[PDB]
Write a protein that binds this ligand. Sequence first.
Ligand SMILES: NC(=O)c1ccc[n+]([C@@H]2O[C@H](COP(=O)([O-])OP(=O)(O)OC[C@H]3O[C@@H](n4cnc5c(N)ncnc54)[C@H](OP(=O)(O)O)[C@@H]3O)[C@@H](O)[C@H]2O)c1
Ligand SMILES: CCc1nc(N)nc(N)c1OCCCOc1ccccc1N1CCC(C(=O)O)CC1
Length: 168
Amino acid sequence: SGLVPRGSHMVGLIWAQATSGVIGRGGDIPWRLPEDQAHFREITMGHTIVMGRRTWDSLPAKVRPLPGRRNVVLSRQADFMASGAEVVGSLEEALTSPETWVIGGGQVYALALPYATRCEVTEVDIGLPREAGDALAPVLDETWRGETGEWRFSRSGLRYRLYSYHRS
Ligand SMILES: NC(=O)c1ccc[n+]([C@@H]2O[C@H](COP(=O)([O-])OP(=O)(O)OC[C@H]3O[C@@H](n4cnc5c(N)ncnc54)[C@H](OP(=O)(O)O)[C@@H]3O)[C@@H](O)[C@H]2O)c1
Ligand SMILES: CCc1nc(N)nc(N)c1OCCCOc1ccccc1N1CCC(C(=O)O)CC1
């Protein structure tokens, strides 16, 4: 289950959420957590990362494409271009690698969920209620089985915990 044969197409989702399920607001993530940034890099490095066009927009121009990973951006706009990366019009076109991490945002998590067999979640204990127009984490049905870590404490003074979910 843990090994990925090279002829397969494994799809995982990775996200960080507040306890309310908020993942994004106003084109940004409404907190910063260094431990989550390190965790995201550790999981995704060396693999293909797939993101929605609005998540590409949310990365500073100087930092994208993200290093050490093949960057794929989803857009329906025939004139949207992502310098340094590949833009495709569907998840089917994006999922050609043996191991793909979908890195957001809310629309693309919902789109990719039917094909995903792993989710890696960071939950931040920050009280941020859901507001209209927020991007939200996908909801996971009972086909998913999860492990929840104990609450840990960030150098930034926020509690956080990690979840790992899997399905067949
Ligand atoms: N906390 C986290 O872990 C995390 C991670 C990533 C992002 N974020 C945040 O989440 C927010 C962005 O999320 P979002 O839901 O607004 O947008 P998104 O999922 O990042 O991108 C949505 C865009 O993807 C394209 N798209 C969607 N469905 C498609 C399909 N079926 N085929 C092809 N292209 C498709 C469209 O691009 P076009 O409009 O160009 O057609 C659409 O506008 C930001 O606030 C960002 O900072 C948070
Ligand atoms: C790190 C945020 C994050 N967390 C988990 N758990 N899942 C995700 N999908 C996810 O969003 C990745 C795309 C947005 O990124 C950022 C947003 C705000 C601050 C920092 C970052 N990043 C730090 C690492 C860097 C890199 O890895 O090069 C890319 C930029």
